[PDB]
Amino acid sequence: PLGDCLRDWEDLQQDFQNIQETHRLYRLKLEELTKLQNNCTSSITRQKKRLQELALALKKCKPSLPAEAEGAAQELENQMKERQGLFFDMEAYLPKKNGLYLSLVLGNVNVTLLSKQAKFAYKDEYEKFKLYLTIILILISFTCRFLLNSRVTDAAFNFLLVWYYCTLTIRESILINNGSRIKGWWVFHHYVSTFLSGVMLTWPDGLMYQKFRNQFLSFSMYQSFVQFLQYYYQSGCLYRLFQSWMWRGLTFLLPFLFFGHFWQLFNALTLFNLAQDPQCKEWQVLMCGFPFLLLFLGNFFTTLRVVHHKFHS
Amino acid sequence: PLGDCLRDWEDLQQDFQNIQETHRLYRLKLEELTKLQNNCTSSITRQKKRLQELALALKKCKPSLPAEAEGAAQELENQMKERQGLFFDMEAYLPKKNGLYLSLVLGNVNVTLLSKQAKFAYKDEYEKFKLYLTIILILISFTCRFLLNSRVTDAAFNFLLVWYYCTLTIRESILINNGSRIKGWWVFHHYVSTFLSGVMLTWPDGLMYQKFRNQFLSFSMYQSFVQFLQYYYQSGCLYRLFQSWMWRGLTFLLPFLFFGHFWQLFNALTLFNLAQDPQCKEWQVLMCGFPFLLLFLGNFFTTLRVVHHKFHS
Numbered sequence: 006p007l008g009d010c011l012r013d014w015e016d017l018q019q020d021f022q023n024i025q026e027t028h029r030l031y032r033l034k035l036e037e038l039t040k041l042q043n044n045c046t047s048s049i050t051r052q053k054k055r056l057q058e059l060a061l062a063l064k065k066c067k068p069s070l071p072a073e074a075e076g077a078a079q080e081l082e083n084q085m086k087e088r089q090g091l092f093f094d095m096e097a098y099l100p101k102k103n104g105l106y107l108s109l110v111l112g113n114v115n116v117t118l119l120s121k122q123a124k125f126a127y128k129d130e131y132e133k134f135k136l137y138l139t140i141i142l143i144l145i146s147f148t149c150r151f152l153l154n155s156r157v158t159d160a161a162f163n164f165l166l167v168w169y170y171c172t173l174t175i176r177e178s179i180l181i182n183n184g185s186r187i188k189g190w191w192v193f194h195h196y197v198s199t200f201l202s203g204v205m206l207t208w209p210d211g212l213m214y215q216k217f218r219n220q221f222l223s224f225s226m227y228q229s230f231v232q233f234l235q236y237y238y239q240s241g242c243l244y245r246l247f248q249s250w251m252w253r254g255l256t257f258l259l260p261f262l263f264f265g266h267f268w269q270l271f272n273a274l275t276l277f278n279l280a281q282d283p284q285c286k287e288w289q290v291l292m293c294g295f296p297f298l299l300l301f302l303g304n305f306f307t308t309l310r311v312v313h314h315k316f317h318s
Numbered sequence: 319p320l321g322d323c324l325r326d327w328e329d330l331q332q333d334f335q336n337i338q339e340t341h342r343l344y345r346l347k348l349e350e351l352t353k354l355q356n357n358c359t360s361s362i363t364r365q366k367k368r369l370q371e372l373a374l375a376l377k378k379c380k381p382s383l384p385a386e387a388e389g390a391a392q393e394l395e396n397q398m399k400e401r402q403g404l405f406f407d408m409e410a411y412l413p414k415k416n417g418l419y420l421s422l423v424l425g426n427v428n429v430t431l432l433s434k435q436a437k438f439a440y441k442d443e444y445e446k447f448k449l450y451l452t453i454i455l456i457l458i459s460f461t462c463r464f465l466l467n468s469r470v471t472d473a474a475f476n477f478l479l480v481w482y483y484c485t486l487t488i489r490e491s492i493l494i495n496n497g498s499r500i501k502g503w504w505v506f507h508h509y510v511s512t513f514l515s516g517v518m519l520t521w522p523d524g525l526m527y528q529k530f531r532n533q534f535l536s537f538s539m540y541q542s543f544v545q546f547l548q549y550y551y552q553s554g555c556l557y558r559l560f561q562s563w564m565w566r567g568l569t570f571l572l573p574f575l576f577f578g579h580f581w582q583l584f585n586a587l588t589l590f591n592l593a594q595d596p597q598c599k600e601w602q603v604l605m606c607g608f609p610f611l612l613l614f615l616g617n618f619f620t621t622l623r624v625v626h627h628k629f630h631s
C-alpha cells in the first residue's frame with residue numbers, strides 16, 4: 006500500500022528535520038569547546054614552565070644566611086608545592102599527548118578519559134580483565150602440566166602468555182597516561198617477562214627441556230594463583246573506597262609474594278646449574294637463565310622498598 | 319633575595335587566578351556538550367532503527383502489481399537510500415562504541431577522531447608508519463638472507479614480523495572504527511600472516527629448514543619491496559586529492575602483485591612436495607604449508623574481484 010507508509014514517512018521526515026537541526030547546532034559548540042581547550046592547555050603549560058624556572062632560581066638563591074625571616078621563604082616554597090599540585094590535578098582533567106610508547110603503537114590519538122566516573126570504571130574493567138585472563142591461564146597451565154600433553158600445547162600456552170603480557174603493557178600505558186603512580190618499575194617487569202616467555206618459546210625439544218618444563222609450568226601455575234589472590238584483595242580494597250583491615254590483609258599476603266620471589270630465585274639457580282653441565286642449546290638455556298634472575302632481583306627489591314615505605318607511616 | 323621573586327610570584331598569582339577562572343568555566347560547557355552528544359546519538363540510533371523497520375516492511379509489500387504509479391515507490395526507495403547515507407555521514411562525525419576487537423585489547427575507550435583534518439592526518443601518519451617499518455624490515459631481511467647469519471637472526475626477524483602484523487591489525491581496526499571501506503578481507507589477511515610467521519618461528523633446526531629458509535627469506539624480501547611500491551603509489555594518489563594517471567599506475571602495478579601471488583602459490587607447492595618426502599617436523603611443515611595456500615587463494619581472489627569491479631566503470 007501507499008497511504009500508511011507515506012504518512013509514517015512524513016512523521017519520519019519531521020523527526021529527521023528535528024535531529025538535523027540539533028546536530029547542525031552542536032557543531033559550533035564542539036568547535037568552541039576545542040578552541041577553549043587548546044587555549045587552556047597552552048596557557049597552563051606556559052605558566053607551569055615559568056613557575057618551574059622561578060622555582061629553580063629561588064632554590065639556588067635559597068641557601069643564603071637565615072639571619073632574616075626566611076621562614077617566609079619556606080612558606081613561599083610550600084605555596085609553590087601546592088601550586089604544582091593544583092596544576093597537576095587540574096590538568097589531569099584535560100586531554101594530553103600520548104607520549105612515546107602509545108605513539109608507536111597507536112599514534113596521535115586523544116586517549117584520555119575526562120570524567121572521574123569514566124576513569125574509575127575503566128580501571129575497574131581493567132582489573133576484571135586481568136582476573137578473567139588469569140583464570141583462563143591457570144586452567145590452560147593445569148591442562149598442560151599434569152594431563153600429559155607435552156608435545157605442542159606448551160607452544161600455544163606460550164603464545165597466550167606473550168599476548169597477555171603485551172596487551173597488559175598497552176593497558177598499563179593507557180592507565181599511566183590517564184594518571185596513576187605505577188611509573189616505578191612494573192612497566193619494565195612486563196617487558197622482561199615477555200622476553201623470557203619468547204626465549205622459552207624458541208627453545209626446541211632436547212632432553213633437559215623436560216626437567217625445565219616441569220619446574221616452569223609448576224611455577225607459572227603458582228604465580229597465576231597468587232595473581233588471582235592479589236586481584237581479589239585489591240578489588241576488595243577499591244570497593245572499600247578500612248585502613249586497618251587493608252594493612253592486615255597486605256601483611257597476610259606478603260609471605261606468599263616473598264615465597265614466589267624466592268621460588269623465582271631457585272628456578273634461576275637450577276637453570277644455571279643445568280646450563281653448567283654438558284648440554285647444547287646454550288643460547289636458549291642461558292638467555293632464559295638471565296631473565297629469572299633479573300626479574301627476581303627487581304621484584305624483591307621493589308617489594309622490600311614499598312613495604313618499608315608503607316611501614317614508615 | 320625576596321622582593322623581586324615575591325613580585326614575580328604576585329604576577330604568577332594573577333595569571334593563576336585567570337587560568338583558574340577559565341578552567342572552572344569550561345567544565346560546565348564540557349558537561350553540556352557530553353549531554354547533548356548522548357541525546358543526539360540515542361535519538362539517531364532510534365530513528366535509524368525505525369527507518370530500517372519501515373524499509374523491510376515496504377520491501378516486502380513492494381513486489382505487488384505495478385499497474386499503479388509505483389514509480390513513486392521507487393522514488394521513495396531512492397529517498398530511503400539517501401536518508402541512510404545522510405544518517406551515515408552525519409554519525410561518522412560522532413563518537414562510537416569500540417565494537418569487539420578493540421574492546422578486547424583496549425576496552426571502553428572513545429577512540430574516535432572528530433575532525434576531517436585530524437582523521438586525514440591520522441591516516442597519513444598510518445601510511446608513513448607502514449612505509450618506515452617496511453624499510454626496516456627489508457634491511458633486516460637483506461642482512462639475514464645473504465650476509466650468512468643463519469643461526470638466530472631469523473628468530474629476531476620473525477619476532478619483528480609478528481609484532482609488525484599485530485600492531486597493523488590494531489591500527490587497521492582503529493581506521494575501520496573511524497570509517498573506511500576496508501572491511502572486506504584484509505583484517506583476516508593480517509591474522510593469517512601472523513599465524514604463519516608464528517608457526518615458522520616454532521620450527522626448529524632440521525635439514526629441509528635450510529632450503530625453506532632460503533625460499534622464504536627471498537619471498538618476504540620481495541613482498542616488502544612491493545609493499546614499498548604500493549605505499550608510494552597510494553601516497554601519490556592521496557596527494558592528488560588525476561583519475562587517468564591513477565588508473566595507468568594501477569595497471570602498471572598489477573603485474574607485480576600477480577607475480578607475488580603466484581610466487582606464494584609456488585612456495586606453498588614446494589612446501590607440500592617437501593613435506594611429502596621422508597621428513598620429520600610434520601607438525602610445523604604442514605601447519606606452515608596450509609597458510610601460504612589459503613593466503614594466496616584469498617589474495618588472488620580479492621585482487622581479481624576488485625580489478626573487475628574497477629573495470630566495470
Ligand SMILES: CC(C)CCC[C@@H](C)[C@H]1CC[C@H]2[C@@H]3CC=C4C[C@@H](O)CC[C@]4(C)[C@H]3CC[C@]12C
Nearest residue numbers: 219220221223224264266267268269270271272
Ligand atoms: C630465608 C630463605 C632463604 C628461605 C628460602 C626457602 C626456599 C629455598 C624454599 C621455600 C619454597 C621452596 C620451593 C617450593 C617449590 C619448589 C618447586 C619444585 O619444583 C622445586 C623445589 C622448589 C623450588 C622449592 C625450593 C626450596 C624453596 C624455594
Ligand SMILES: CC(C)CCC[C@@H](C)[C@H]1CC[C@H]2[C@@H]3CC=C4C[C@@H](O)CC[C@]4(C)[C@H]3CC[C@]12C
Nearest residue numbers: 532533534536537577578580581582583584585
Ligand atoms: C602464468 C603464471 C602461472 C606463470 C607463473 C610463473 C611463476 C610460477 C614462475 C616465474 C618466476 C619463477 C620464480 C623465480 C624466482 C624464484 C625465487 C626462488 O628463490 C624460488 C623460486 C621462484 C619463486 C620461482 C618460482 C616460479 C616462478 C614464480
